[PDB]
Write a protein that binds this ligand. Structure first.
Ligand SMILES: Nc1ncnc2c1ncn2[C@@H]1O[C@H](COP(=O)(O)OP(=O)(O)OP(=O)(O)O)[C@@H](O)[C@H]1O
Ligand SMILES: Nc1ncnc2c1ncn2[C@@H]1O[C@H](COP(=O)(O)OP(=O)(O)OP(=O)(O)O)[C@@H](O)[C@H]1O
Ligand SMILES: Nc1ncnc2c1ncn2[C@@H]1O[C@H](COP(=O)(O)OP(=O)(O)O)[C@@H](O)[C@H]1O
Lengths: 735, 735
């Protein structure tokens, strides 16, 4: 009449040896309810993963609750079982026929033990059960030397009739006291790929994320493993940790890693599955999971897609499962325990869509920010992936890895794995369709498939409000020497003399204004500074922040200011301020005035932010209001006129990188002399036109001829007039 | 067949001794239904944390109904049980093994009893129970010296095998009349933090709320304790109290403290959780709650999230749970009784979001308003927090507290608590990473972690209507003596001649206006006046009142005017009046005209605000309409022009305070003489630019040289033209 539905796993206590494989503590009523003899094998469905881990069963001592079951740490780790997964029990399969080879693998060790062995076979196969796909055991105490040693038993040779049961349980035979089947120590094989066993996630897979993953590790370590330190204080420890960022950054993998590396109980909600038609069913499920987490002292709560289950209260009054659930859960967690050891993780894609009641400092104080990987992080990810896929299947060199990382500017970490997979597909196709099913070992991995993959991937990460570490070197930029020297001076003053300024009480100007021709040297300078300084860079587009709704731009400005404040000292750059600054001449609406007063208040109004640096670039400097155009804020002004010969030569070389300079025969000096009064955008347009003319001659071309460049120069005009130069000169004279 | 659903606690009547620990006046039918011996222990589920206050059971005299149960005031105080809490009976647990040490704590006392103790052990352990966490007993009557003494039994070393029992009750075995176990009279420590017992809240915990908390105390004391006070005049006592203010200020603490300190029944609704699919079920529960509250004379009603459950009728006509619940609750509260003794507390985040039908003189006339804490209140809050934290874990001198309070101009109590929490987190992680898990007591809490915490706290309360300025004294202010006696006269007339105005009929003109070139220190003088005068101030900006929603600006203006009226005679200053005033020169929406008409009607129409003083400053006189430029309303005009020679000399002192004048070699008056066409803001800009030049010339210096000041003067223009000064003089002449 008990009718058990689901079970919860639990590690075997008391340590020592005991049984350690077939504990399977089950209430006698449940033992009789399954119509299977207790002193025999048992099966744990765990709603999937067929094979069902055939293991022997044993009785309890009347102190084991029905809802829990012990499947031993070894089996829990081998089967990729995490504390909190739903477990189901049913009848057992046929008895194991026999074992053929059973050979160790010597995980994370150099092997060659011999003396250190001391008959591992006895301590390994003496246990009842011991399923042959995988055993891992603690070092215990072997001879003199202590240390930690572990072995794995992947490799198999026997054949089992039931294809559904891939776990192929085998029996153990012995002859002795205190000889296997033709030894067991051989080779240092890794996890076998034949059975496709689930390899537990580890921190080694994630690379380039070190600082914030370490911070999260500490912030999860200090509540749970050492609660007495806080219990001495007793100041309401934090329970919620924010994990948000762009999609594809790998938050799910981080959650899996922190769940696997910790033996404590965790909760994995399915999201909308908890939502039910009944009014009180959701509350019953919430209180059930909460009291389950409270009953077992070490517990962790994982919540994903908060914006879906718990949307914003004001944004949408959908009803049913709504902010009432938020209120109930907050009230429950606000008094569930004084100190305890409980961790709640809120992993959401966009905190803005989340109810701002969730984003309260009192409860959800801890916040972790995840951004798109930079060049170093991308290189680390690629190297880790190459190490994981092993050198026997590829022939690559590290310089190609830097080249690939540099070629990927806006690529996300999720894009790299797909790029590798599609490169594998391209290599497989290029081998098959060409050589008629030749051996794939020789072809391995090359660079042409990777190049084709990055050409045809077409990522959807181009549109974004924040780009992280643009890549442009000083051998690619174009500008005048005085501007470069000045920018170096005012980037080296604050970051190297903040303490000196604090001692003198003068701080930093925190304002730079740029104005010049629309060609170049006004926008690419920000990217050059971002690449050189290695500091966080914020780019804001004028028309982008404009919205039909009035007041949205104010919220965007507040959000970007908060991001700049919370994202360490950085530099803030605006692409075009001339599209929002004019509020009188342009007869703009109240939104422009609100934006102007907001930026005026944020720059030097009743608040001072020494760490951040504000730099702006504009095309026409006159329409900016005098309130913003005041010395003290953006006081520094640079004339920065049209690019000179070497800068134009440099941008021509940059545009000629795809082509070959020596094949064309151009010395880069005649073209620079001919193109002197033009602009950088005009130079790019001329290069594009010359390339089009070259490729329309005889289809694909390996080089561009000088006649095409001459035709492009003649046909296309600069479009610039001395009037704008005189206007800039007279504006600079009055300033 | 009775099927008891839930039970509510009640203090043990008749005083005396009786049981006083194990009264347990439950109906015998419930005892028989649970299949447990009446002379055995009992437990209350109270939703979660099973094992609360294992206490022996007994029977009643068939008079007390099933719903109400009694567990005595001692157990009520021990378990922090709120009156009328929902309790679910559970089966008993096996008898306690033994008591190990037993030692008193001497709550709220200096201990050292000895002579007047007179063997409290016999009376302490003669009663059944004596639980490990503690007991609370009244002083009763022992010898002479009256007064009140209480003892708690916090510290003990009893071991219990099951971790489910959170209260681990112990048995009683002592020898006495009318040899122990290692005595019990020792130490005077507080509640043990190892067992993390829930300490009830106290009025001393909340700081900086003295006036409003005393008003709330009086408002909740008038109806209940002495209903005759209000029933003598026979005008019916109020039943509802409105609590409102910024989120996370004091509401939950007020509710919890008034619930704990009052022996009356306390009931808190679950808000939207009560709402179900059945329309009539919630309303039937509402009559059930009202009948339960009316049945017992001492009762407290707590209402939360009023806006969520009772929105504005006109704002949203959704359906289902709607104004019908408002009408039924209004009818229930209108005719519950004639005099009675019942207080209803309504804590809402937004008063305007609440349905105005609720805000009625006959129902919810009483309102409690709590603003954002000022410097003094925040300092008191921080000092109370450090007092609670105690000096055994950290050291903090008073000046650091004052500096932190001054820095945290806009922080809220929740923000301060979160900042302290993540300060402790940062200290713990820093110590761990720097010393490999060293003792945290030696490192404790310093100012560096606090500074890092306030840098990375990411404040969210900056966008607030109420703002507090930095405090500046007249010595810090450099200004001319001209008009100083005038402004002293205007500030001293309403405040120090209210009776003279009332008798003579002169009243308050309430008209002060400021004008002149930007940087003429009008805002600085207003801030200095507000700081020195020691009077309440309301910070109003130009665009701040301008709201995107139609009518929101009018509501904000009405709210700020009501706050000024109810916050004693004060001063209201507009930072930028040159935005709301212009309605004819430029194209403006009808909202600006409505605001102008409303302010014109408020300043002098129909009503006169004698107590408060209206002062404003403008950047251009043409923007002010002729309607406001009339005698009686802003008739007084203060020139407050550019600073004089002596004023600029005094200004130069403040900017040079960080530097040292002696080694500079300048006389500090010749530089001021050379700078006569500038303004105070312009002088500050010149000093800042000179400091920037000094730090950019040779980095670290201890002084600014004459050459730097000369270069700053040469490179910066005054930016002021005589024509605008002439226009200002002409405008002043005509008015
Ligand atoms: N830092 C990384 N290193 C390696 N692979 C990564 C990284 N970030 C993402 N990936 C790749 O992206 C995929 C994992 O994406 P995952 O779903 O975990 O991302 P997420 O940002 O948490 O988003 P989602 O909301 O879809 O869960 C895998 O293919 C994985 O290889
Ligand atoms: N004056 C204060 N001193 C110390 N801590 C405070 C103070 N005010 C608020 N807090 C902190 O903020 C938390 C919540 O604040 P508070 O209880 O005052 O909010 P509330 O307005 O009643 O709640 P809600 O956000 O639900 O309306 C407290 O538990 C405490 O940690
Ligand atoms: N002599 C001075 N020393 C220091 N600060 C000054 C001085 N004069 C003006 N200020 C600062 O400049 C501000 C003056 O504001 P103001 O420009 O008059 O406002 P508005 O733009 O409405 O005219 C004040 O907030 C004050 O802090």
């Amino acid at each position: 009449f008990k009718l058990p539905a689901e079970f919860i796993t639990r590690p075997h206590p008391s340590k020592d040896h005991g049984k350690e494989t077939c504990t399977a503590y089950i209430h006698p009523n449940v033992l009789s309810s399954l119509e299977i003899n207790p002193g025999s094998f048992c099966t744990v469905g765990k709603i999937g993963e067929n094979g069902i881990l055939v293991i022997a069963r044993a009785g309890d001592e009347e102190v084991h609750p029905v809802n829990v079951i012990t499947l031993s740490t070894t089996i829990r780790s081998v089967g990729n079982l995490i504390l909190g997964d739903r477990l189901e029990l049913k009848k057992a399969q046929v008895q194991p026929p026999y074992a053929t080879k059973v050979t160790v693998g010597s995980l994370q060790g150099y092997n060659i033990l011999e003396c250190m062995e001391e008959k591992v076979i006895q301590k390994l196969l003496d246990d009842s059960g011991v399923i042959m796909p995988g055993m891992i055991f603690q070092n215990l105490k072997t001879k003199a030397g202590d240390e930690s040693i572990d072995v794995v038993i992947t490799d198999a040779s026997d054949d089992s009739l039931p294809d559904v049961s891939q776990l192929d349980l085998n029996m153990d035979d012995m002859y002795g006291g205190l000889g296997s089947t033709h030894i067991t120590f051989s080779k240092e094989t890794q996890a076998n790929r034949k059975y496709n066993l689930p390899e537990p996630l580890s921190y080694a897979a994630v690379g380039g994320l070190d600082k914030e993953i370490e911070s999260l590790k500490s912030a999860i370590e200090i509540p749970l493993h050492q609660p007495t330190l806080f219990s001495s204080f007793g100041v309401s420890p934090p329970r919620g940790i924010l994990l948000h960022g762009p999609p594809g950054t790998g938050k799910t993998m981080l959650l899996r890693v922190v769940a696997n590396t910790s033996n404590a109980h965790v909760l994995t909600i399915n999201g909308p599955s908890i939502v039910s038609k009944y009014l009180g069913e959701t509350e019953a499920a919430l209180r059930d999971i909460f009291n389950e987490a409270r009953k077992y002292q070490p517990s962790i709560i994982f919540i994903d897609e908060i914006d879906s289950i718990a949307p914003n209260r004001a944004n949408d009054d959908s009803g049913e499962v709504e902010s009432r659930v938020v209120a109930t859960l907050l009230t429950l967690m606000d008094g569930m325990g004084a100190a305890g050891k409980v961790v709640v993780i809120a992993a959401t894609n966009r905190p803005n869509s989340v109810d701002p009641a969730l984003r309260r400092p009192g409860r959800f104080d801890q916040e972790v920010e995840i951004g798109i990987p930079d060049v170093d992080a991308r290189f680390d990810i690629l190297t880790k992936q190459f190490s994981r896929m092993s050198s026997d299947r590829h022939v690559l060199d590290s310089e190609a890895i830097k080249y690939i990382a540099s070629k990927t500017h806006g690529y996300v970490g999720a894009d790299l794995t797909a790029l590798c997979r599609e490169s594998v597909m391209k290599t497989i196709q290029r081998g098959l369709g060409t050589d008629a099913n030749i051996d794939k070992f020789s072809l391995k991995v090359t660079l042409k498939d990777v190049e084709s993959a990055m050409v045809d991937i077409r990522p959807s990460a181009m549109r974004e409000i924040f780009l992280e570490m643009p890549k442009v070197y000083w051998s690619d930029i174009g500008g005048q020497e005085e501007l470069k020297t000045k920018m170096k001076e005012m980037i080296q003053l604050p970051l190297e003399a903040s303490e000196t300024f604090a001692r003198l009480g003068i701080s930093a100007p925190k304002g730079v204004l740029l104005y010049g021709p629309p060609g170049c040297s006004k926008t690419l300078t920000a990217k050059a500074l971002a690449t050189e300084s290695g500091i966080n860079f914020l780019a804001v587009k004028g028309p982008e922040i404009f919205n039909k709704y009035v007041g949205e731009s104010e919220r965007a400005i507040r959000e970007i200011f908060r991001k700049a404040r919370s994202a360490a000292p950085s530099i803030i750059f605006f692409d075009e301020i001339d599209a929002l600054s004019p509020d009188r001449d342009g007869s703009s609406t109240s939104a422009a005035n609100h934006v102007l007063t907001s930026l005026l208040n944020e720059i030097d109004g009743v608040e001072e932010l020494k760490g951040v640096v504000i730099v702006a670039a504009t095309n026409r400097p006159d329409e900016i209001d005098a309130a913003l155009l005041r010395p003290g804020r953006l006081d520094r002004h640079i004339y920065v006129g049209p690019p000179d010969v070497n800068a134009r030569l440099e941008i021509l070389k940059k545009c000629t990188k795809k082509f070959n300079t020596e094949e064309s025969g151009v010395d880069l000096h005649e073209l620079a002399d001919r193109t002197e009064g033009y602009s950088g955008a005009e130079v790019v347009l001329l290069c594009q036109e010359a390339g089009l003319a070259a490729i329309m001659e005889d289809l694909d071309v390996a080089k561009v001829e000088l006649r095409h460049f001459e035709k492009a120069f003649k046909g296309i005009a600069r479009g610039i007039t001395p009037e704008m130069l005189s206007y800039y000169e007279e504006f600079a004279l009055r300033s």
